[PDB]
Amino acid sequence: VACK
Amino acid sequence: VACK
Amino acid sequence: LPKSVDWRKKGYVTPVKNQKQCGSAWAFSATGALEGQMFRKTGKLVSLSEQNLVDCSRPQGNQGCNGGFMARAFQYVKENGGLDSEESYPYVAVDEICKYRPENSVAQDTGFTVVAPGKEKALMKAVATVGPISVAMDAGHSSFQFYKSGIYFEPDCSSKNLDHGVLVVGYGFEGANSQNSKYWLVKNSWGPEWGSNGYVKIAKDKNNHCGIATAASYPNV
Amino acid sequence: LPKSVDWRKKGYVTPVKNQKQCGSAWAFSATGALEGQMFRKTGKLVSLSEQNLVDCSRPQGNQGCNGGFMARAFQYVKENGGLDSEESYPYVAVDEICKYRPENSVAQDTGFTVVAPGKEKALMKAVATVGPISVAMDAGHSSFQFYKSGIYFEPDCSSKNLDHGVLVVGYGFEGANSQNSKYWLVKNSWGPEWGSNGYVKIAKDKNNHCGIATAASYPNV
Ligand SMILES: [Cl-]
Ligand SMILES: [Cl-]
Protein backbone atom coordinates (compact mmCIF):
# COMPACT_ATOMS: atom_id res chain seq x y z
CA VAL A 1 0.00 0.00 0.00
CA ALA A 2 1.83 3.23 0.99
CA CYS A 3 1.80 5.22 4.15
CA LYS A 4 3.32 2.95 6.90
CA VAL B 1 10.93 38.42 44.76
CA ALA B 2 10.87 34.71 45.30
CA CYS B 3 10.77 32.43 42.38
CA LYS B 4 11.85 33.32 38.88
CA LEU C 1 -4.30 33.83 8.82
CA PRO C 2 -2.61 33.71 12.27
CA LYS C 3 1.17 33.94 12.52
CA SER C 4 1.14 30.67 14.45
CA VAL C 5 -1.29 27.92 15.36
CA ASP C 6 -1.09 25.11 17.88
CA TRP C 7 -4.24 23.02 18.31
CA ARG C 8 -2.71 21.14 21.28
CA LYS C 9 -3.23 24.27 23.33
CA LYS C 10 -6.97 24.26 22.58
CA GLY C 11 -7.78 20.69 23.58
CA TYR C 12 -8.03 19.14 20.08
CA VAL C 13 -5.17 16.64 20.38
CA THR C 14 -4.84 13.39 22.38
CA PRO C 15 -1.50 12.37 23.99
CA VAL C 16 1.07 10.85 21.64
CA LYS C 17 0.51 7.22 20.77
CA ASN C 18 2.84 4.41 19.61
CA GLN C 19 2.18 2.21 16.54
CA LYS C 20 5.04 -0.09 17.63
CA GLN C 21 6.07 -2.73 15.02
CA CYS C 22 3.11 -2.38 12.75
CA GLY C 23 2.90 -0.24 9.58
CA SER C 24 -0.22 1.58 10.81
CA ALA C 25 0.87 5.20 10.90
CA TRP C 26 -1.89 5.89 8.33
CA ALA C 27 -4.42 4.77 10.97
CA PHE C 28 -2.90 7.04 13.66
CA SER C 29 -2.90 10.00 11.33
CA ALA C 30 -6.53 9.33 10.51
CA THR C 31 -7.66 8.92 14.13
CA GLY C 32 -5.74 12.10 15.05
CA ALA C 33 -7.58 14.14 12.44
CA LEU C 34 -10.94 12.63 13.40
CA GLU C 35 -10.20 13.28 17.09
CA GLY C 36 -9.77 16.96 16.34
CA GLN C 37 -12.91 17.27 14.18
CA MET C 38 -15.05 15.44 16.67
CA PHE C 39 -13.77 17.77 19.36
CA ARG C 40 -14.58 20.86 17.21
CA LYS C 41 -18.08 19.40 16.76
CA THR C 42 -18.93 18.31 20.32
CA GLY C 43 -16.44 19.77 22.74
CA LYS C 44 -15.37 16.30 23.86
CA LEU C 45 -11.97 14.81 23.31
CA VAL C 46 -12.25 11.05 22.82
CA SER C 47 -9.37 8.81 21.79
CA LEU C 48 -10.29 6.74 18.66
CA SER C 49 -9.41 3.20 17.65
CA GLU C 50 -6.56 2.65 15.24
CA GLN C 51 -7.09 -1.08 15.63
CA ASN C 52 -10.60 -0.75 14.36
CA LEU C 53 -9.13 0.79 11.17
CA VAL C 54 -6.38 -1.83 10.89
CA ASP C 55 -8.68 -4.80 11.20
CA CYS C 56 -11.72 -3.52 9.30
CA SER C 57 -10.77 -1.35 6.37
CA ARG C 58 -9.37 -3.89 3.94
CA PRO C 59 -12.46 -3.41 1.61
CA GLN C 60 -11.57 0.25 1.28
CA GLY C 61 -8.06 -0.61 0.17
CA ASN C 62 -6.00 -0.54 3.38
CA GLN C 63 -3.74 -3.46 4.36
CA GLY C 64 -3.50 -3.17 8.10
CA CYS C 65 0.01 -3.46 9.48
CA ASN C 66 1.24 -3.65 5.87
CA GLY C 67 0.23 -0.04 5.11
CA GLY C 68 -2.70 2.08 4.13
CA PHE C 69 -4.00 5.63 3.49
CA MET C 70 -5.77 8.17 5.59
CA ALA C 71 -8.31 8.94 2.81
CA ARG C 72 -9.20 5.23 2.61
CA ALA C 73 -9.67 5.25 6.38
CA PHE C 74 -12.05 8.26 6.25
CA GLN C 75 -13.92 6.36 3.45
CA TYR C 76 -14.25 3.35 5.76
CA VAL C 77 -15.63 5.40 8.62
CA LYS C 78 -18.22 6.90 6.15
CA GLU C 79 -19.23 3.57 4.59
CA ASN C 80 -19.28 1.87 7.94
CA GLY C 81 -21.36 4.44 9.76
CA GLY C 82 -18.97 4.84 12.69
CA LEU C 83 -15.65 4.17 14.47
CA ASP C 84 -15.06 2.73 17.95
CA SER C 85 -13.17 4.37 20.78
CA GLU C 86 -9.53 3.45 21.67
CA GLU C 87 -10.81 2.19 24.96
CA SER C 88 -13.39 -0.14 23.59
CA TYR C 89 -11.27 -1.46 20.67
CA PRO C 90 -7.70 -1.44 21.93
CA TYR C 91 -4.50 -1.34 19.94
CA VAL C 92 -2.40 -4.50 19.73
CA ALA C 93 -0.17 -3.70 16.69
CA VAL C 94 -1.01 -6.84 14.67
CA ASP C 95 -3.64 -7.65 12.05
CA GLU C 96 -6.68 -9.16 13.80
CA ILE C 97 -10.33 -10.04 13.12
CA CYS C 98 -12.65 -7.09 12.58
CA LYS C 99 -14.58 -6.54 15.82
CA TYR C 100 -16.36 -3.29 15.00
CA ARG C 101 -19.25 -2.72 17.43
CA PRO C 102 -21.77 -0.04 16.52
CA GLU C 103 -22.83 0.46 20.12
CA ASN C 104 -19.25 1.53 20.89
CA SER C 105 -19.03 4.06 18.06
CA VAL C 106 -18.02 7.58 19.10
CA ALA C 107 -17.23 9.15 15.73
CA GLN C 108 -18.67 9.53 12.22
CA ASP C 109 -17.72 11.26 9.01
CA THR C 110 -19.43 11.87 5.63
CA GLY C 111 -16.26 11.74 3.58
CA PHE C 112 -13.23 13.98 3.57
CA THR C 113 -11.76 17.16 2.11
CA VAL C 114 -8.44 17.21 0.17
CA VAL C 115 -5.92 20.05 0.26
CA ALA C 116 -4.62 21.14 -3.13
CA PRO C 117 -1.56 18.96 -3.76
CA GLY C 118 1.78 20.57 -3.21
CA LYS C 119 0.30 23.84 -1.98
CA GLU C 120 1.78 24.81 1.39
CA LYS C 121 -0.41 27.92 1.56
CA ALA C 122 -3.52 25.85 1.06
CA LEU C 123 -2.33 23.59 3.85
CA MET C 124 -1.68 26.62 6.10
CA LYS C 125 -5.27 27.80 5.52
CA ALA C 126 -6.63 24.35 6.32
CA VAL C 127 -4.60 24.09 9.57
CA ALA C 128 -5.70 27.56 10.67
CA THR C 129 -9.40 27.24 9.95
CA VAL C 130 -10.20 23.55 10.43
CA GLY C 131 -7.99 21.89 13.03
CA PRO C 132 -5.33 19.13 12.79
CA ILE C 133 -4.80 17.86 9.23
CA SER C 134 -3.69 14.33 8.10
CA VAL C 135 -0.58 14.43 5.87
CA ALA C 136 1.88 12.03 4.30
CA MET C 137 5.62 12.60 4.38
CA ASP C 138 8.98 11.13 3.46
CA ALA C 139 10.23 9.83 6.84
CA GLY C 140 12.64 7.26 5.43
CA HIS C 141 15.89 8.68 6.84
CA SER C 142 18.00 8.07 9.83
CA SER C 143 17.95 11.85 10.51
CA PHE C 144 14.23 11.47 11.13
CA GLN C 145 14.57 8.41 13.17
CA PHE C 146 17.05 10.22 15.44
CA TYR C 147 15.48 13.67 15.32
CA LYS C 148 15.44 15.33 18.68
CA SER C 149 14.85 19.07 18.37
CA GLY C 150 14.93 22.11 16.14
CA ILE C 151 13.55 22.44 12.63
CA TYR C 152 13.94 19.28 10.67
CA PHE C 153 15.47 19.64 7.23
CA GLU C 154 16.78 16.71 5.23
CA PRO C 155 18.47 17.19 1.84
CA ASP C 156 17.62 13.72 0.69
CA CYS C 157 13.86 14.29 1.35
CA SER C 158 11.30 13.68 -1.39
CA SER C 159 8.16 15.77 -1.88
CA LYS C 160 6.72 13.05 -4.17
CA ASN C 161 7.46 9.57 -2.89
CA LEU C 162 6.11 9.39 0.58
CA ASP C 163 6.06 6.64 3.15
CA HIS C 164 4.59 7.74 6.45
CA GLY C 165 1.33 9.27 7.68
CA VAL C 166 1.48 11.94 10.39
CA LEU C 167 -0.68 14.82 11.71
CA VAL C 168 -0.08 18.57 11.35
CA VAL C 169 -1.37 20.15 14.57
CA GLY C 170 -0.13 23.68 13.86
CA TYR C 171 2.63 25.85 12.50
CA GLY C 172 4.89 28.56 13.77
CA PHE C 173 8.19 30.27 13.53
CA GLU C 174 11.35 30.69 15.43
CA GLY C 175 12.46 34.14 16.49
CA ALA C 176 10.68 37.49 16.19
CA ASN C 177 10.00 37.61 12.48
CA SER C 178 6.93 35.56 11.66
CA GLN C 179 8.53 34.59 8.36
CA ASN C 180 12.05 33.08 8.43
CA SER C 181 12.56 29.79 10.28
CA LYS C 182 8.92 28.80 9.74
CA TYR C 183 7.87 25.26 10.63
CA TRP C 184 5.02 22.78 10.62
CA LEU C 185 4.16 21.30 14.06
CA VAL C 186 3.82 17.54 13.44
CA LYS C 187 2.50 14.82 15.73
CA ASN C 188 4.12 11.39 15.13
CA SER C 189 2.99 7.93 16.29
CA TRP C 190 6.32 6.57 17.60
CA GLY C 191 5.56 7.31 21.24
CA PRO C 192 6.29 10.38 23.41
CA GLU C 193 9.88 9.25 23.78
CA TRP C 194 10.67 9.82 20.12
CA GLY C 195 11.67 13.25 18.90
CA SER C 196 10.45 16.24 20.87
CA ASN C 197 7.86 14.67 23.22
CA GLY C 198 6.58 12.76 20.20
CA TYR C 199 6.51 15.81 17.89
CA VAL C 200 8.77 17.17 15.15
CA LYS C 201 9.06 20.68 13.66
CA ILE C 202 9.34 20.32 9.90
CA ALA C 203 10.68 23.17 7.75
CA LYS C 204 7.79 25.19 6.31
CA ASP C 205 7.52 27.16 3.02
CA LYS C 206 10.77 25.51 1.82
CA ASN C 207 9.39 23.94 -1.34
CA ASN C 208 7.03 21.48 0.31
CA HIS C 209 9.82 19.83 2.29
CA CYS C 210 9.40 16.08 2.79
CA GLY C 211 6.07 16.26 0.93
CA ILE C 212 4.01 17.59 3.88
CA ALA C 213 1.52 19.35 1.53
CA THR C 214 1.51 16.61 -1.21
CA ALA C 215 -1.34 14.44 0.17
CA ALA C 216 -3.15 16.29 2.97
CA SER C 217 -6.74 15.75 3.96
CA TYR C 218 -9.27 15.96 6.80
CA PRO C 219 -12.59 14.21 7.60
CA ASN C 220 -15.92 15.97 7.23
CA VAL C 221 -17.88 15.51 10.45
CA LEU D 1 0.02 4.44 45.70
CA PRO D 2 1.02 3.61 42.05
CA LYS D 3 4.76 2.84 41.50
CA SER D 4 4.69 5.60 38.92
CA VAL D 5 2.56 8.34 37.47
CA ASP D 6 2.70 10.36 34.29
CA TRP D 7 -0.14 12.86 33.88
CA ARG D 8 1.06 13.69 30.35
CA LYS D 9 -0.36 10.36 29.19
CA LYS D 10 -3.81 11.28 30.59
CA GLY D 11 -4.36 14.63 28.80
CA TYR D 12 -3.54 16.94 31.79
CA VAL D 13 -0.46 18.69 30.39
CA THR D 14 -0.03 21.37 27.67
CA PRO D 15 3.15 21.50 25.53
CA VAL D 16 6.40 22.82 26.97
CA LYS D 17 6.47 26.63 27.02
CA ASN D 18 9.35 29.14 27.25
CA GLN D 19 9.50 32.04 29.69
CA LYS D 20 12.43 33.52 27.78
CA GLN D 21 14.20 36.49 29.46
CA CYS D 22 11.66 37.15 32.10
CA GLY D 23 11.64 35.80 35.73
CA SER D 24 8.15 34.45 35.31
CA ALA D 25 8.57 30.71 36.05
CA TRP D 26 6.10 31.15 38.93
CA ALA D 27 3.45 32.03 36.37
CA PHE D 28 4.26 29.00 34.20
CA SER D 29 4.14 26.74 37.18
CA ALA D 30 0.75 28.19 38.25
CA THR D 31 -0.80 27.91 34.78
CA GLY D 32 0.51 24.33 34.51
CA ALA D 33 -1.24 23.32 37.71
CA LEU D 34 -4.43 25.21 36.82
CA GLU D 35 -4.42 23.61 33.36
CA GLY D 36 -4.39 20.17 34.90
CA GLN D 37 -7.15 20.94 37.41
CA MET D 38 -9.39 22.58 34.79
CA PHE D 39 -8.90 19.55 32.56
CA ARG D 40 -9.84 17.22 35.43
CA LYS D 41 -13.02 19.22 35.94
CA THR D 42 -14.16 19.69 32.32
CA GLY D 43 -12.27 17.28 30.08
CA LYS D 44 -10.87 20.23 28.05
CA LEU D 45 -7.16 20.99 28.00
CA VAL D 46 -6.73 24.72 27.35
CA SER D 47 -3.52 26.70 27.59
CA LEU D 48 -3.75 29.57 30.11
CA SER D 49 -2.19 33.03 29.97
CA GLU D 50 1.04 33.50 31.88
CA GLN D 51 1.07 37.06 30.56
CA ASN D 52 -2.25 37.71 32.33
CA LEU D 53 -0.54 36.65 35.57
CA VAL D 54 2.61 38.69 34.91
CA ASP D 55 0.70 41.90 34.10
CA CYS D 56 -2.18 41.70 36.57
CA SER D 57 -1.18 40.10 39.88
CA ARG D 58 0.98 42.83 41.37
CA PRO D 59 -1.81 43.60 43.92
CA GLN D 60 -1.45 40.05 45.26
CA GLY D 61 2.31 40.51 45.79
CA ASN D 62 3.75 39.12 42.56
CA GLN D 63 6.44 41.10 40.72
CA GLY D 64 6.04 40.03 37.12
CA CYS D 65 9.40 39.42 35.38
CA ASN D 66 11.04 40.10 38.75
CA GLY D 67 9.63 36.98 40.34
CA GLY D 68 6.52 35.85 42.18
CA PHE D 69 4.75 32.96 43.81
CA MET D 70 2.38 30.27 42.51
CA ALA D 71 0.12 30.71 45.53
CA ARG D 72 -0.21 34.47 44.91
CA ALA D 73 -1.12 33.60 41.38
CA PHE D 74 -3.91 31.22 42.48
CA GLN D 75 -5.02 34.05 44.88
CA TYR D 76 -5.19 36.47 41.99
CA VAL D 77 -7.36 34.06 39.91
CA LYS D 78 -9.69 33.79 42.92
CA GLU D 79 -9.91 37.51 43.65
CA ASN D 80 -10.23 38.37 39.93
CA GLY D 81 -12.94 35.84 39.20
CA GLY D 82 -11.07 34.34 36.25
CA LEU D 83 -7.96 33.91 34.05
CA ASP D 84 -7.72 34.40 30.27
CA SER D 85 -6.66 31.76 27.71
CA GLU D 86 -3.14 32.01 26.27
CA GLU D 87 -4.79 32.43 22.88
CA SER D 88 -6.62 35.55 23.91
CA TYR D 89 -3.74 37.02 26.03
CA PRO D 90 -0.44 36.03 24.42
CA TYR D 91 2.97 35.82 26.10
CA VAL D 92 5.62 38.41 25.23
CA ALA D 93 8.09 37.85 28.14
CA VAL D 94 8.11 41.43 29.49
CA ASP D 95 6.09 43.29 32.10
CA GLU D 96 3.09 45.04 30.54
CA ILE D 97 -0.11 46.79 31.55
CA CYS D 98 -2.99 44.51 32.58
CA LYS D 99 -5.39 43.64 29.72
CA TYR D 100 -7.62 41.11 31.42
CA ARG D 101 -11.13 40.59 29.97
CA PRO D 102 -13.75 38.47 31.74
CA GLU D 103 -15.23 37.50 28.32
CA ASN D 104 -11.92 35.71 27.61
CA SER D 105 -11.70 33.79 30.86
CA VAL D 106 -11.48 30.02 30.67
CA ALA D 107 -10.49 29.22 34.23
CA GLN D 108 -11.40 29.90 37.86
CA ASP D 109 -10.25 28.80 41.29
CA THR D 110 -11.47 29.27 44.87
CA GLY D 111 -8.08 29.31 46.45
CA PHE D 112 -5.38 26.67 46.77
CA THR D 113 -4.15 23.69 48.82
CA VAL D 114 -0.67 23.46 50.28
CA VAL D 115 1.06 20.07 50.43
CA ALA D 116 2.64 19.34 53.80
CA PRO D 117 5.97 21.16 53.70
CA GLY D 118 9.12 19.14 53.29
CA LYS D 119 7.26 15.84 53.04
CA GLU D 120 7.99 13.92 49.86
CA LYS D 121 5.46 11.21 50.67
CA ALA D 122 2.77 13.92 51.02
CA LEU D 123 3.86 15.20 47.63
CA MET D 124 3.78 11.70 46.13
CA LYS D 125 0.23 11.30 47.42
CA ALA D 126 -0.87 14.62 45.94
CA VAL D 127 0.78 13.86 42.56
CA ALA D 128 -0.96 10.47 42.45
CA THR D 129 -4.45 11.67 43.46
CA VAL D 130 -4.81 15.32 42.24
CA GLY D 131 -2.81 15.77 39.07
CA PRO D 132 0.22 18.02 38.32
CA ILE D 133 1.51 20.00 41.31
CA SER D 134 3.21 23.37 41.46
CA VAL D 135 6.54 23.31 43.26
CA ALA D 136 9.57 25.48 43.93
CA MET D 137 13.14 24.25 43.62
CA ASP D 138 16.75 25.32 43.87
CA ALA D 139 17.74 25.61 40.18
CA GLY D 140 20.69 27.90 40.94
CA HIS D 141 23.45 25.61 39.71
CA SER D 142 25.16 25.21 36.38
CA SER D 143 24.44 21.49 36.43
CA PHE D 144 20.72 22.31 36.11
CA GLN D 145 21.28 24.77 33.26
CA PHE D 146 23.20 22.07 31.34
CA TYR D 147 21.10 19.10 32.30
CA LYS D 148 20.31 16.73 29.45
CA SER D 149 19.16 13.32 30.68
CA GLY D 150 19.02 10.90 33.55
CA ILE D 151 18.25 11.54 37.19
CA TYR D 152 19.33 14.98 38.25
CA PHE D 153 21.28 15.03 41.51
CA GLU D 154 23.22 18.07 42.55
CA PRO D 155 25.26 17.73 45.74
CA ASP D 156 25.24 21.49 46.38
CA CYS D 157 21.43 21.71 46.13
CA SER D 158 19.46 23.49 48.81
CA SER D 159 16.06 22.27 50.03
CA LYS D 160 15.41 25.63 51.76
CA ASN D 161 16.56 28.41 49.51
CA LEU D 162 14.56 28.09 46.32
CA ASP D 163 14.55 30.25 43.27
CA HIS D 164 12.50 28.60 40.50
CA GLY D 165 8.92 27.42 40.05
CA VAL D 166 8.32 24.17 38.07
CA LEU D 167 5.51 21.56 37.71
CA VAL D 168 5.65 17.98 38.94
CA VAL D 169 3.65 15.93 36.37
CA GLY D 170 4.52 12.52 37.74
CA TYR D 171 7.13 10.28 39.29
CA GLY D 172 8.75 6.97 38.60
CA PHE D 173 11.93 4.96 38.79
CA GLU D 174 14.75 3.84 36.52
CA GLY D 175 15.71 0.18 36.33
CA ALA D 176 13.50 -2.79 37.22
CA ASN D 177 13.12 -2.07 40.96
CA SER D 178 10.33 0.33 41.86
CA GLN D 179 12.14 1.49 45.00
CA ASN D 180 15.59 2.25 43.50
CA SER D 181 16.59 5.23 41.36
CA LYS D 182 13.32 7.01 41.96
CA TYR D 183 12.59 10.40 40.44
CA TRP D 184 10.09 13.25 40.16
CA LEU D 185 8.97 13.97 36.57
CA VAL D 186 9.23 17.78 36.17
CA LYS D 187 8.00 20.13 33.44
CA ASN D 188 10.23 23.23 33.14
CA SER D 189 9.48 26.48 31.25
CA TRP D 190 12.73 26.95 29.36
CA GLY D 191 11.43 25.59 26.06
CA PRO D 192 11.69 22.09 24.55
CA GLU D 193 15.31 22.50 23.66
CA TRP D 194 16.42 22.60 27.34
CA GLY D 195 16.99 19.36 29.25
CA SER D 196 15.09 16.25 28.25
CA ASN D 197 12.86 17.95 25.65
CA GLY D 198 11.88 20.44 28.29
CA TYR D 199 11.56 18.00 31.20
CA VAL D 200 13.84 16.86 33.98
CA LYS D 201 13.88 13.81 36.26
CA ILE D 202 14.85 15.02 39.77
CA ALA D 203 16.04 12.53 42.33
CA LYS D 204 13.17 11.40 44.57
CA ASP D 205 13.16 10.32 48.19
CA LYS D 206 16.69 11.56 48.56
CA ASN D 207 15.99 13.99 51.35
CA ASN D 208 13.75 16.47 49.53
CA HIS D 209 16.40 17.05 46.93
CA CYS D 210 16.56 20.61 45.58
CA GLY D 211 13.50 21.44 47.81
CA ILE D 212 10.92 19.84 45.47
CA ALA D 213 8.57 19.15 48.40
CA THR D 214 9.30 22.33 50.37
CA ALA D 215 6.67 24.65 48.86
CA ALA D 216 4.23 22.54 46.79
CA SER D 217 0.62 23.58 46.08
CA TYR D 218 -2.28 23.27 43.66
CA PRO D 219 -5.40 25.40 42.85
CA ASN D 220 -8.86 24.33 44.04
CA VAL D 221 -11.35 24.40 41.11
CL1 LIG E 1 -4.32 9.56 2.24
CL1 LIG F 1 4.06 29.54 45.90
Residue numbers in the entry:
A (entry chain PA): 444 to 447
B (entry chain PB): 452 to 455
C (entry chain AA): 1 to 221
D (entry chain BA): 222 to 442
What's written in the study?
Hence, we set out to determine the crystal structures of cathepsin complexes with representative peptides of cleaved substrates. As a working model, cathepsin V was chosen because of the resolution of diffracting crystals (up to 1.3 Å) and crystal packing with accessible active site cleft.
The pattern I group (binding of cleaved peptide fragments to the non-primed side) consisted of structures of six peptides that were cleaved, and only their N-terminal fragments remained bound in the non-primed sites S4–S1. Two peptide fragments, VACK and TAHE, were the exceptions because their main chain ran into the S3 binding area. Not unexpectedly, the cleaved peptides indicated that both cathepsin V mutants retained their residual proteolytic activity under crystallization conditions as observed previously. Peptides from patterns I and IV bound to cathepsin V consistent with the observed protein cleavage sites, whereas the peptides from patterns II and III did not bind according to their cleavage site found in proteins.
